[PDB]
Amino acid sequence: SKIRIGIVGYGNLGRGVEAAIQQNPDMELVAVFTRRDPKTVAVKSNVKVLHVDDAQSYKDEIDVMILCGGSATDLPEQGPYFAQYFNTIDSFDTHARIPDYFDAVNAAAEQSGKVAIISVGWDPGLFSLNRLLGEVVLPVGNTYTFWGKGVSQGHSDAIRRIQGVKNAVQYTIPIDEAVNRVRSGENPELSTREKHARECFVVLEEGADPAKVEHEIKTMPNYFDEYDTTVHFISEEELKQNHSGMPHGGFVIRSGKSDEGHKQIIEFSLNLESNPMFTSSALVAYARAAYRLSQNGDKGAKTVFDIPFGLLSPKSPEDLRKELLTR
Template identity: 60%
Template sequence: MAEKVRIGIVGYGNLGRGAELAVEKNPDMELAGIFTRRDPNTIQTATNANVYCQDNIRSFQDKLDVLILCGGSASDLPEMSPELARLFPIVDSYDNHAKIPDHYKKVNQAAEEAGKLAIISAGWDPGLFSLNRLLGEIVIPDGGTHTFWGKGLSQGHSEAVRRVEGVKKGVQYTVPMEEILEDARNGKGEDLTAAERHKRVCYIVADEKDHARIEEEIKTMPDYFAPYDTTVHFIDEETFDSEHQKMRHGGFVIRSGNSSKAHKQAMEFSLTLESNPEFTASVLVAYARAAYHLHKKGETGAKTPFDIPFSAMTHKTSAEIMKDLL
């Protein structure tokens, strides 16, 4: 067997734990280490992986092939991705759609200067949903694209909520408008914005004296909540722990339009996820394989999922995927 791809994971929250489990599912990979800002001695991993202090990561440059960055998009990845792209090939799941071009520019500059390769915004949205939006436009040029998220817990938006001062615990659920979802399947409503297709519902544990301020900060948060119909519920910690620990999610990308005056066509891609972080991590691990192979071929700079062929993401040979899947 060829040498295994040596993976490092930065951050050990829900996404990092999912990446650890996903690496274990891929026989051509091995987990070389988990890197954390917490005390490594306090971390109990799912697979008894080695845990190291993130401050020492520079000393692992000859021991790792790809880093999977499992920090949050609100404040971790904007700093972490450019910094670490100077040291290793990286993959991140940066998901603030409005700021992806700026994030790309910063990561691309860092990776190009260092001769490294970085894949950004690799998850299911952005990521797999992005690919399906593009495919729909290619195949049905005369039409409209509709993206719906949920009902489910959004990791990025939940992380943004928890960054609000005074929030002890918090989650955010994205809920599609059912009637608009059905309209999309019938070729209607392509001009609606994401905010018109969904509502956002937050459940927060916080001191009572902070409720009004926290609700206002959440509802006016740029790029995350400001354009949406957002409801904020304040609940006690016991209710939060018993009712809001599941991380189910999913959604739909629907492209509908006309191939002629006589015929309407529709394409639909959907996900139903019992664990949002585990699925997202599985996508990151697949893109980590691509980062490894493309970097070995000499490619550098930042890439998005649009730039990565599926053939670079699989451990199978071209002959195998042609025989088994074409």
């Protein structure tokens, strides 16, 4: 029998999960859940769409609910809410709130006897795994994480909420000189501004003051005041033509030394033409783990740090040992 997946939220992430389920034949999409009236949400695979208030009635129809919502508002409620009725996966990515979200999700999942895996994706998720690995395998050394080149939704949206901006896309861009110094094993000390540049393409509103927009962008706290930021005004057509993708990538590098002074370097890198399609394929892999864990009577909140990779595969442990352990 197939692992029965439900999706909450049908944004780029939910649409990404639906596509990943197409590539995971042990799985089937039973339902999509939305805040919206169902009738307004056109699901490509033509599965039933339903309102989230109905979801509790599907407790016995779904093995794993993959929560596709944002972290600022959707997850803080949805994580604990759905953990009461299903095993869940989410992409929660808010640094300062992780301990609280975890405790919250965990309390509900313990209560319900369900498995919740939070903060899955590539960062957090894959990259977090690699920060950890770097640090345990090479305890004397330094970890560097770089993001990009690619489109940051959050920074794009930040620019767009400026009055005077009609639309925008921002690229987060590792600065080469900084990545080469890391790669070449110099173990540099690097400030925020030395690691990433930011590059913005902006479509002005009628009557805007460019200089004022540029100024609000470059002096915005958190988003841009710590980085070299460039701004470029272009038309809507240009924004659609050249900046419609959601590529991204990055790398986690650990550079350390043996106790006899040998320079050792670990690098895990990603180069994605679709960020949300990637993130969502990870979500679905982890759903498999949540299921197998649930099936062995496990429960509670987990992160990627608690999940053995074998559980992510449909292949049996024997076949993994046979096929992938070496050569």
